[PDB]
Design a protein around this ligand. Structure first.
Ligand code: OLC
Ligand code: OLC
Ligand code: OLC
Ligand code: RET
Ligand code: LFA
Ligand code: LFA
Length: 216
């Protein structure tokens, strides 16, 4: 799966760029007070575009490791929560959640990286997973409660935003745990790549759809 993994990096790079340019162009189709999440979403795909180029160059040099993705994640995961809050909150409530959810997301990714950079199945490996998993659940529970105030088309549009994250992000912990049950190292990189594309481009598209409802 070496050639597939490398070819998927290039596919992701084009995919992230495609998402970046699509969101930047479509940003004026929504009213200015609803554009911030669209801009953030494009920034998200653009950072991922930048990193997937870096990871492909790393793979050609023969020096890649799974820890290279974490540089991406530590920036974009907090920004993805921000692009969701950008469309669901305002004022003091927005500032508090951005801080709190962004701290939690950073802790989740850092704890993951701690466990990632040790032997599969070591104590550091399990320590990282438990801390990251706890922050993951806290985040998903907070995301579920976020829709509890919406109504009408906004609730429908937010349900799609919520469900993409709830469903699409499961692959990340699953991929982390799999190498302790079998030889899943190669497939973990293939699936993370595909998932990053769906999750970043897809979330941007759904945030844009939500900004469309808010402007219409
Ligand atoms: C040998 C290689 C075989 C590879 C085979 C391909 C596997 C692709 C898997 C991706 C994981 C992420 C998928 C996440 C999908 C979530 C979709 C979702 O929940 O969408 C909700 C949204 O509201 C709808 O409008
Ligand atoms: C931060 C936001 C503000 C600044 C936006 C700048 C836009 C440039 C992006 C990278 C283009 C070059 C990417 C080079 C990749 C080289 C590599 O990794 O190979
Ligand atoms: C796949 C696209 C469709 C969405 C699938 C996930 C739906 C889901 O998880 O729904 C939970 C429900 O909202 C709990 O009340
Ligand atoms: C932009 C790409 C995304 C959305 C990546 C998200 C990352 C995670 C949700 C991963 C979290 C982890 C766990 C919940 C458990 C094990 C450690 C991690 C970091 C893989
Ligand atoms: C292994 C289990 C990891 C999660 C345990 C704590 C969950 C906290 C939920 C909030
Ligand atoms: C990797 C696989 C992650 C799990 C995907 C589950 C999809 C469920 C679709 C919605 C069903 C109702 C909750």
């Amino acid at each position: 799966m070496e050639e597939l993994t490398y070819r998927l990096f290039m596919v992701a790079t084009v995919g992230m760029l495609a998402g970046t340019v699509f969101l930047l162009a479509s940003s004026r189709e929504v009213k200015p007070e609803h554009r911030r999440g669209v801009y953030i979403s494009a920034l998200v795909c653009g950072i991922a575009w930048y990193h997937y180029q870096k990871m492909g160059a790393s793979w050609e040099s023969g020096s890649y490791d799974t820890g290279l993705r974490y540089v991406d994640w530590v920036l974009t995961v907090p920004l993805m929560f921000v692009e969701v809050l950008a469309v669901t909150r305002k004022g003091a409530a927005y500032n508090e959640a951005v801080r709190n959810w962004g701290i939690a997301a950073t802790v989740m990714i850092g704890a993951g990286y701690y466990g990632e950079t040790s032997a599969a199945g070591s104590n550091e490996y399990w320590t990282g997973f438990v801390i990251a998993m706890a922050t993951y659940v806290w985040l998903m529970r907070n995301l579920q409660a976020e829709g509890e105030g919406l109504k009408g088309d906004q609730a429908v549009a937010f349900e799609n935003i919520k469900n993409l994250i709830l469903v699409g992000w499961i692959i990340y912990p699953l991929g982390y745990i799999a190498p302790v049950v079998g030889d899943f190292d190669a497939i973990r990189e293939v699936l993370y790549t595909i998932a990053d594309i769906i999750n970043k481009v897809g979330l941007g598209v759904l945030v844009l759809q939500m900004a469309r409802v808010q402007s219409g």
